[PDB]
Amino acid sequence: VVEYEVVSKNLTSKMSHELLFSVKKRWFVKPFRHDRQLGKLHYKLLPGNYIKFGLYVLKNQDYARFEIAWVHVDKDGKIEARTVYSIETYWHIFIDIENDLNCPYVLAKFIEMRPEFHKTAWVEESNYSIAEDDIQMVESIKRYLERKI
Ligand code: NI
Numbered sequence: 001v002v003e004y005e006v007v008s009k010n011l012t013s014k015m016s017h018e019l020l021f022s023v024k025k026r027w028f029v030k031p032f033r034h035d036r037q038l039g040k041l042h043y044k045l046l047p048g049n050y051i052k053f054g055l056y057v058l059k060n061q062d063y064a065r066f067e068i069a070w071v072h073v074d075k076d077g078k079i080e081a082r083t084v085y086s087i088e089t090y091w092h093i094f095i096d097i098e099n100d101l102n103c104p105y106v107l108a109k110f111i112e113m114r115p116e117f118h119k120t121a122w123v124e125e126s127n128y129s130i131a132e133d134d135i136q137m138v139e140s141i142k143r144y145l146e147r148k149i
Contacts, residue, residue, distance in 0.1 A: 009039025023049040137146035
């Protein structure tokens with residue numbers, strides 16, 4: 001195993017919401033600890049491939065930046081992340097995606113698991129898996145956001 005770290009915080013002015021997805025498990029990774037105090041999620045990741053989903057929101061700016069990063073972990077414990085996608089848009093539009101009936105579910109779910117005020121977000125025990133592989137999946141999200149934006 002190897003310990004990794006992302007941000008999950010929702011304050012007065014901004015919100016940084018990062019979740020990490022398991023490429024193999026085809027659903028989000030169950031985090032071993034959450035840090036309400038410093039607004040952080042702590043993961044114990046089997047060496048493998050992982051997508052990190054980033055949502056960054058300046059509320060007062062009605063600003064939302066959504067990213068997707070590829071997180072590669074080797075058996076030597078070495079971590080390397082890279083962004084593969086990024087877009088910037090109105091937060092109001094992003095909050096609207098939650099209620100979009102015909103949308104990329106994992107996306108509608110990520111958004112939906114955003115952190116409650118001053119709390120962190122959380123992930124639930126699951127064996128559930130989406131239909132598509134990580135490529136299709138990412139692409140479906142991209143294809144949508146473009147039409148959405
Ligand atoms: Ni490798």
